[PDB]
Amino acid sequence: SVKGLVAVITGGASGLGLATAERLVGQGASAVLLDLPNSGGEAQAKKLGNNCVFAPADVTSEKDVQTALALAKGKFGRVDVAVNCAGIAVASKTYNLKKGQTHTLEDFQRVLDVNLMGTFNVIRLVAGEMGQNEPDQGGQRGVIINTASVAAFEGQVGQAAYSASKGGIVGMTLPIARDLAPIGIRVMTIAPGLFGTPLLTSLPEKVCNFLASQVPFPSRLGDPAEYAHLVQAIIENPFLNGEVIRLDGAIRMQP
Amino acid sequence: SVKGLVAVITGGASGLGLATAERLVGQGASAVLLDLPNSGGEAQAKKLGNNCVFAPADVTSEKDVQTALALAKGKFGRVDVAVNCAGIAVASKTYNLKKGQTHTLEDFQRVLDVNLMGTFNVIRLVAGEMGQNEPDQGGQRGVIINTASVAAFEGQVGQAAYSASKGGIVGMTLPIARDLAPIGIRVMTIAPGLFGTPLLTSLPEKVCNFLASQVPFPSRLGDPAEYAHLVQAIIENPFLNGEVIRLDGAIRMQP
Amino acid sequence: SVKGLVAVITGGASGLGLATAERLVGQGASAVLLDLPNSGGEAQAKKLGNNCVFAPADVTSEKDVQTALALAKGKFGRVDVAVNCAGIAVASKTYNLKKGQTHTLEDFQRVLDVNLMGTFNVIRLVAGEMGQNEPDQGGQRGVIINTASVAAFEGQVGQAAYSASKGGIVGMTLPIARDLAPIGIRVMTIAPGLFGTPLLTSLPEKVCNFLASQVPFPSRLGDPAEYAHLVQAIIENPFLNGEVIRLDGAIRMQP
Amino acid sequence: SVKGLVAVITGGASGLGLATAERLVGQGASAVLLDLPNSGGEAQAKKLGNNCVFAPADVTSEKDVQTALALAKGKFGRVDVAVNCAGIAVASKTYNLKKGQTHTLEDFQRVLDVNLMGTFNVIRLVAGEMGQNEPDQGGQRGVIINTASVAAFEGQVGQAAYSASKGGIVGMTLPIARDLAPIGIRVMTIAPGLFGTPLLTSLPEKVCNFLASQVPFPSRLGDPAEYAHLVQAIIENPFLNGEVIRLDGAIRMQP
Amino acid sequence: AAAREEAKNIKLLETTEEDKQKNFLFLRLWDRNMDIAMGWKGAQAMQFGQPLVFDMAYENYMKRKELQNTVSQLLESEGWNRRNVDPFHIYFCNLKIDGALHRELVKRYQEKWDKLLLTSTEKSHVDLFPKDSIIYLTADSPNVMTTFRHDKVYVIGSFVDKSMQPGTSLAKAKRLNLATECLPLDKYLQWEIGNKNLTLDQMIRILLCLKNNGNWQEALQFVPKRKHTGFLE
Numbered sequence A, B, C, D: 001s002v003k004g005l006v007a008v009i010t011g012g013a014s015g016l017g018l019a020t021a022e023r024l025v026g027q028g029a030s031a032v033l034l035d036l037p038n039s040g041g042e043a044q045a046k047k048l049g050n051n052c053v054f055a056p057a058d059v060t061s062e063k064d065v066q067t068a069l070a071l072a073k074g075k076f077g078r079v080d081v082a083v084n085c086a087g088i089a090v091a092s093k094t095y096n097l098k099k100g101q102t103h104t105l106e107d108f109q110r111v112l113d114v115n116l117m118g119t120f121n122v123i124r125l126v127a128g129e130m131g132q133n134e135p136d137q138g139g140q141r142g143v144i145i146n147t148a149s150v151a152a153f154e155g156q157v158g159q160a161a162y163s164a165s166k167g168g169i170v171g172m173t174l175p176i177a178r179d180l181a182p183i184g185i186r187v188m189t190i191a192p193g194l195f196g197t198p199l200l201t202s203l204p205e206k207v208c209n210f211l212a213s214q215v216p217f218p219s220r221l222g223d224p225a226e227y228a229h230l231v232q233a234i235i236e237n238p239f240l241n242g243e244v245i246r247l248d249g250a251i252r253m254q255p
Numbered sequence E: 001a002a003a004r005e006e007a008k009n010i011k012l013l014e015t016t017e018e019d020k021q022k023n024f025l026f027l028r029l030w031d032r033n034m035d036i037a038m039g040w041k042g043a044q045a046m047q048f049g050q051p052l053v054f055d056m057a058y059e060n061y062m063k064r065k066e067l068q069n070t071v072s073q074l075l076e077s078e079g080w081n082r083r084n085v086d087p088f089h090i091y092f093c094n095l096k097i098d099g100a101l102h103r104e105l106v107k108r109y110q111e112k113w114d115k116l117l118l119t120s121t122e123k124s125h126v127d128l129f130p131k132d133s134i135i136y137l138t139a140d141s142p143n144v145m146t147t148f149r150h151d152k153v154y155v156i157g158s159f160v161d162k163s164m165q166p167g168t169s170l171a172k173a174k175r176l177n178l179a180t181e182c183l184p185l186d187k188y189l190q191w192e193i194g195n196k197n198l199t200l201d202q203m204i205r206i207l208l209c210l211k212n213n214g215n216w217q218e219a220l221q222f223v224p225k226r227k228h229t230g231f232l233e
């Protein structure tokens, strides 16, 4: 069970973060949806009930995340789990010879800031918050679960910046786990494949059908409920640490 | 859930396989401990209850595995899950200039037979029985979980044959997942680290404490119950496929 | 043979970049040491000879890299190879509970900007520069080699930012190779281990000597000449693309 | 340079092994083509010159490899390099539900015996002779370069046994490197992609053409001269050890 | 084109911007990706797929117009095969290199011909597969197909005879002494008015539906509706 746990879910107003919040609150936990002010996260928080609260914050801003964690601590008294699901996607080729078009540096920089820098900002602040928790019978003060992508391993054409940020998350998973091992905080990463979230369901139906056919088995877009299930499995297993799990249905992206 | 599932657990009379069988049978599932005739699996199967039966088989023999699968079908009528936990360990340096001692081809071949050839034997034979299953909601007919090792990635001195077998398992995890995708069988691999099973206690007790300390967090040898928990999580999640999960507590093996 | 090639080597005034420039200019190629103005690159460029020039530039600035590439085109007329060796290191734990010390977002941002963002800036601008080349017999217009670290895989304590940046480089290596394949540009990454450069000799000699002793074979710090040799080998072999090569001497880092 | 070196090349009568032998002997080295008696090795040795000899041996047999190594020592006096390029491919699906066809255990065993068991046999036997070598100025007594495939990491349908053998080679690369580090022997692995050799004769011509077109860049089949060049580069770089190098032109295999 | 130009200027008048926030995971290169996926599947089928033969041995029984029709139906059949989740391994047997049919196929396919993932050969289906595994599909066979068999090689006559020549495919199959089967159309459909010989594309679609565990109703949904009146209950 995860009853009584407090989860800070960044990007918790939509998609994978929303599914994780729904599952965890359904099992009896308390959730803090840390999201952007104009993401409609207050409606989701109210829909989830009393055990869910909304924190309007930008993961790329230290002050916003600090205020969100202060709100979480005041409302629920502590933080046990952190789920970094905030992120943005951008498609852009590094260089197009035919069009003479070059990848803009702003796109790369903002993708980095939102994904990699935002994940690290949340991780460090929430690790500081967890360090105050009395270790349990197993000596654990908390769990941090980051959302990478399979683009961190076989990113496609136009995914240079996205792949850079997700590969950064993958590369920094183990060092942070080693850093926080003395503190008793487990650090894990989930690298989902193609999931039926607003980041993908907004595409034309033919594209969605093709993507579903591209998954070996099951030949469908991943359900966010499956991501939530894997997150809960990581939370409950005390021996999963410093590892990246590919929740992608055995797909390997084509160029 | 796992209520009503039938699991064939190779090497299920001791260690990780026994823990998996205990967890699954304790949750309303049925277990077939496929183990060697002299492994003392009859006592384990009797202790577990009626939902557990013992099949004396050698995973390296086609006839024995076929007989065990026939017994499983006769007793329960189905095979939903397969868990390859049968394996042996050999410690021997490839060469020793100081001693002039060379690895014997027999040791390498025995390790490969039990660990890599037996695993593929069981997989290929149980895909036949899981292929007779009527696909359920989602098109899945079964799940196959394999036990690799972190030695497939970071192998230590005098561990070349074990590393070869586990690396073969890791390498063939994805091709087999691509083979059985049309059938609807998910193929997963677990790469456990250091676990408190009879395999490790054979080492000197002084070394047990050192190995426990060598784990970043938790600083202890893994509990087989955690392996069973990860196995159940893989069974429950319908989107994990063709992936290797390191259940090692962030440990990295040194030379 | 690399005679006649033009290599833009970032961070070419010291360490691995200087070793690469020395090796390549010795063969007969022309080099452009793209480095910070107050770095001593002028002396190195004068020492190397008439085929080496110094470009005072910051890899994190678009204008500076544009000026450096304009200087390279004005001097040598074209660019054939681009070796990204610019980078910085920071040692800082993500969080220290005993000291109550938290990693500063400034350090993480700075390391990301230099190691990761600057690498992509140089990659995109030099890909634009190399698209003007007439393809050779094999249809190749240029080669881009980037420097990563084994921290991308085996990150140590207080290496979260460095590991994040190097993992970002590793993740972006393949997407960029897929992007630039139609142009005819190969993208490769070298993940060195420990080398005897100014980035390491700064650290206390005791810990550096301990790390050097822990390299399986050769039990020493890597020689930058070896890095330059691998760079030349990558340049020569036309079939190496989208791959990371660990030039670490078989060392896997410990926490 | 590589002048005066003695290289034992397994499977050196055809394809990658023959290309490696040609390159090394042309560079001034000595070669022993360790191959099957009916493989046409003697004609290749005659065509290469007086610095190359043919050893009729089966890598799956200890006695044959011992005789080949004795012949190599008699002719040249020492062994410095060992290139394991002997292997076979099998195209068989694990299980075919529609056809009711099951992978034959004999095919899996044969592929494992040749690709994986034979490689380790050669490695362990040749380490004994390379241990008698006087250590170099850097302490190096010799180099062993194994051949793997990208199937070890991404194996397609009907490649379970081949993937298992190549993954076993990949997994055992590092343990053997650690084992032989004390005696100054470097162990490296090359994972080629698609090369034009008699190995691919089995596939239909159109399948080979499509696969070649699916290489990002260069969009063609690998030239064995490139494999030989990479082998020589590994021979000449004293700091490459324990690593796997993907020589595949950035291709990634799909189901 | 003119309507699209004027409407394009009209759509330019909006200038609303803020389109998806530029939060895109993939570039719009979907046709290329679909083609590449179909190519990978075709390679897998060429290696492990079930054989299906079109025997191009009727050039002497067909006029020019019938030859053009046969080529068009062959293209449609091949296209339908490529898209399938489990494609056949298509063989073009008895295809003379310099014959009229091969010439038209090459003209129609251009450079794609050498890249089509199928086996084209001058040899007959009896020189490539055991005579026992070959089932030659004809509308005049005494036997009636009951179930699709996955270990059998089905042979379809690439023949379009708008001038009726009954028994030609049956006669050809009889010279080689091959087993013959006919699609069940009297059993499942009230035939009404029409011709009992379907086109190549319809045949391949029916066979593909059957190979994917489809029933006879779903498989025979590809029979033109104008011919029959309903599926017999």
Ligand SMILES: NC(=O)c1ccc[n+]([C@@H]2O[C@H](COP(=O)([O-])OP(=O)(O)OC[C@H]3O[C@@H](n4cnc5c(N)ncnc54)[C@H](O)[C@@H]3O)[C@@H](O)[C@H]2O)c1
Binding pocket: A010, A011, A012, A013, A014, A015, A016, A017, A034, A035, A036, A039, A057, A058, A059, A060, A085, A086, A087, A088, A089, A114, A118, A147, A148, A149, A150, A191, A192, A193, A194, A195, A196, A197, A198, A199, A200
């Ligand atoms: N959707 C996929 O198929 C897929 C696949 C692999 C990885 N991912 C990653 O999984 C994560 C889950 O996102 P999703 O798929 O649900 O898409 P999503 O857009 O539905 O979820 C992203 C969430 O992050 C929030 N957010 C964005 N920027 C923020 C910021 N600066 N501060 C705070 N909150 C911010 C958004 O408001 C939203 O709630 C993302 O990081 C995504 O890149 C998604």
Ligand SMILES: NC(=O)c1ccc[n+]([C@@H]2O[C@H](COP(=O)([O-])OP(=O)(O)OC[C@H]3O[C@@H](n4cnc5c(N)ncnc54)[C@H](O)[C@@H]3O)[C@@H](O)[C@H]2O)c1
Binding pocket: B010, B011, B012, B013, B014, B015, B016, B017, B034, B035, B036, B039, B057, B058, B059, B060, B085, B086, B087, B088, B089, B114, B118, B147, B148, B149, B150, B191, B192, B193, B194, B195, B196, B197, B198, B199, B200
């Ligand atoms: N013990 C660890 O910490 C650890 C770590 C990593 C991997 N592993 C792997 O996990 C698996 C679990 O082993 P364990 O730790 O429980 O040790 P164990 O010895 O308790 O379990 C091994 C089991 O395999 C059975 N077995 C061996 N050969 C067999 C054969 N031919 N036919 C049938 N059964 C056979 C044995 O009887 C025994 O029941 C093994 O494959 C092991 O290599 C273990």
Ligand SMILES: NC(=O)c1ccc[n+]([C@@H]2O[C@H](COP(=O)([O-])OP(=O)(O)OC[C@H]3O[C@@H](n4cnc5c(N)ncnc54)[C@H](O)[C@@H]3O)[C@@H](O)[C@H]2O)c1
Binding pocket: C010, C011, C012, C013, C014, C015, C016, C017, C034, C035, C036, C039, C057, C058, C059, C060, C085, C086, C087, C088, C089, C114, C118, C147, C148, C149, C150, C191, C192, C193, C194, C195, C196, C197, C198, C199, C200
């Ligand atoms: N030293 C090692 O063993 C090791 C190991 C793994 C990776 N690396 C990476 O190798 C690369 C080479 O470092 P090194 O060992 O030669 O140390 P170094 O300090 O000599 O190399 C860094 C060089 O980059 C230049 N540089 C830094 N920031 C710059 C900027 N913004 N614009 C332009 N030039 C800039 C510096 O002036 C210097 O010349 C670094 O990227 C490092 O992270 C080093």
Ligand SMILES: NC(=O)c1ccc[n+]([C@@H]2O[C@H](COP(=O)([O-])OP(=O)(O)OC[C@H]3O[C@@H](n4cnc5c(N)ncnc54)[C@H](O)[C@@H]3O)[C@@H](O)[C@H]2O)c1
Binding pocket: D010, D011, D012, D013, D014, D015, D016, D017, D034, D035, D036, D039, D057, D058, D059, D060, D085, D086, D087, D088, D089, D114, D118, D147, D148, D149, D150, D191, D192, D193, D194, D195, D196, D197, D198, D199, D200
């Ligand atoms: N061909 C490719 O594109 C490709 C790709 C990846 C890996 N590989 C590996 O590269 C190696 C070279 O194969 P190749 O492409 O040159 O094909 P090949 O058939 O020309 O090479 C195989 C060689 O091994 C020899 N051989 C086979 N069994 C032997 C045995 N038992 N004892 C001694 N010699 C034996 C054969 O006589 C032959 O000379 C193989 O191990 C193959 O698996 C090849």
Ligand SMILES: Nc1ncnc2c1ncn2[C@@H]1O[C@H](CSCC[C@H](N)C(=O)O)[C@@H](O)[C@H]1O
Binding pocket: E137, E138, E139, E155, E156, E157, E158, E159, E160, E161, E165, E166, E167, E168, E169, E170, E181, E182, E183, E185, E196, E197, E198, E199, E200, E203
């Ligand atoms: N009802 C049916 N049963 C079996 N095969 C059929 C069929 N209708 C069409 N076909 C197949 O489609 C091909 C094109 S129809 C041409 C029919 C011509 N009378 C002949 O001699 O074959 C036929 O050759 C046969 O292979």
